[PDB]
Design an enzyme around this catalytic site. Structure first.
Site, PDB file in Angstrom:
ATOM      1  N   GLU A 162       0.979  -1.318   0.010  1.00  0.00           N
ATOM      2  CA  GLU A 162      -0.104   0.026  -0.155  1.00  0.00           C
ATOM      3  C   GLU A 162       1.054   1.373   0.019  1.00  0.00           C
ATOM      4  OE1 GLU A 162      -2.826  -0.919  -0.806  1.00  0.00           O
ATOM      5  OE2 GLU A 162      -3.848  -1.750   0.865  1.00  0.00           O
ATOM      6  N   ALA A 163       2.587   1.444   0.536  1.00  0.00           N
ATOM      7  CA  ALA A 163       3.210   2.247   0.557  1.00  0.00           C
ATOM      8  C   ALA A 163       3.277   2.539  -0.594  1.00  0.00           C
ATOM      9  CB  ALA A 163       4.382   1.732   1.844  1.00  0.00           C
TER      10      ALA A 163
END
Ligand SMILES: *[C@@H]1O[C@H](CO)[C@@H](O)[C@H](O)[C@H]1NC(C)=O
Ligand SMILES: Nc1ncnc2[nH]cnc12
EC number: 3.2.2.22
Length: 261
Positions: free
Chosen positions: A175-176
Site C-alpha cells: 500500500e505504501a
C-alpha cells in the site's frame, strides 16, 4: 531481478524512502505512464514476480513474494530449522503456487511447507487478527520489526500474530508503494506506533477506481467526480488529476492509451 531488501531493525526515513523508490521502479512497466504517474505492467510481463526481504532487529528475516501486476502478496518464506519454510495462501494453486514455492524456496535446497490456511483479502485477515477493522491494528517500524521476530525461525505461532504481521507488512510495503500518501504517513510517524486514519483505508480501498479515473482523464479532468475521504473521515470530492496525483505512487494497469504526461 534483484530481491529488494529493507532493514526494519536499523531503519531511517531516508532508507525507507529509498526502499519505496526501488520497489516502484522494479514494479513499474518502464514505458506505461499516465499524467507522469508510472503504471504496473499487465499479466504477460517478462518478469511476473518481485521478492522483498525484510529484516528485523533480531536479525531474523522474512521474504515476501509479490505479483508484479498488482503488487499482491502471494506468500512468504522464513529460515527455519536449517530449511526454507514457505507459507502460501490457500487460494494460490497450480502454476502460480509452484512458481511461488519454487521461487521462495529452491527445489535444490532443503525446504518445508507451512500453509497459510486462509486467503489474503483484508476481511479475512481482520477476522484472523480478531478486529472489526484494521484501523485497530497499529503500524510502525518497531511493530514490523518485533513481528518479524515473533514468526521467523519459530516452530509455533498463532494465526492471530501471523494475520497481524501480514496486515502490517501489506500496508507498509504494497500500500505504501501504491500510495505516496501512505508512504508519507509512515515517514511522519517514523518513531512511533500509529493507527491508519480514514484517508489511508479509503485510498487502499479505491486504488482500482483512482487508476481508471486518471487513465480516462481528458486534459487533466476526471471523467466524473471521485468521492473520497479526508484524514478526519469527512467527504473529499476530487475533480482533477492534480488534486489526487500527490497521493499516488503507482497506477494499477488499465488497458489502452492515456495522456502520458
Ligand atoms: C486493449 O487496448 C487495445 C488498444 O486500444 C485494444 O486493441 C484491445 O482490444 C484492448 N483489449 C481489451 C481486452 O479490451
Ligand atoms: N494480499 C495483499 N497484498 C497486497 N495488497 C493487498 N490488499 C489486500 N490484500 C492484499
Amino acid at each position: 531481478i534483484n530481491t529488494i531488501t529493507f532493514d526494519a531493525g536499523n531503519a531511517t526515513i531516508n532508507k525507507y524512502a529509498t526502499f519505496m523508490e526501488s520497489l516502484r521502479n522494479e514494479a513499474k512497466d518502464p514505458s506505461l505512464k499516465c499524467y507522469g504517474i508510472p503504471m504496473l505492467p499487465n499479466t504477460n510481463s517478462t518478469i511476473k514476480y518481485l521478492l522483498v526481504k525484510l529484516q528485523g532487529a533480531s536479525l531474523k528475516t522474512i521474504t515476501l513474494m509479490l505479483r508484479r501486476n498488482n503488487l499482491y502478496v502471494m506468500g512468504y518464506s522464513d529460515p527455519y530449522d536449517n530449511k526454507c519454510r514457505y507459507h502460501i495462501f490457500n487460494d494460490i494453486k497450480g502454476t502460480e503456487y509452484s512458481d511461488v514455492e519454487n521461487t521462495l524456496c529452491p527445489s535444490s535446497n532443503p525446504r518445508v511447507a507451512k500453509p497459510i490456511n486462509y486467503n489474503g483479502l483484508y476481511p479475512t485477515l481482520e477476522k484472523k487478527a480478531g478486529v472489526t477493522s484494521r484501523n485497530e491494528v497499529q503500524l510502525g517500524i518497531q511493530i514490523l520489526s518485533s513481528d518479524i521476530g515473533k514468526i521467523s525461525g519459530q516452530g509455533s505461532f498463532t494465526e492471530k500474530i501471523e494475520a497481524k504481521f501480514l496486515l502490517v507488512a501489506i500496508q507498509m510495503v504494497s500500500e505504501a508503494a501504491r500510495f505516496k500518501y501512505i508512504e508519507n504517513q509512515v515517514k511522519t510517524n517514523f518513531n512511533r506506533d500509529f493507527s491508519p486514519n480514514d484517508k489511508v483505508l479509503d485510498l487502499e480501498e479505491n486504488w482500482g477506481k483512482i487508476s481508471t479515473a486518471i487513465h480516462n482523464s481528458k486534459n487533466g479532468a476526471l471523467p466524473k467526480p471521485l468521492e473520497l475521504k479526508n484524514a478526519d473521515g469527512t467527504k473529499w470530492i476530487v475533480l482533477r488529476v492534480d488534486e489526487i496525483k500527490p497521493d499516488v505512487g503507482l497506477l494499477n494497469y488499465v488497458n489502452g492509451t492515456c495522456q502520458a504526461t
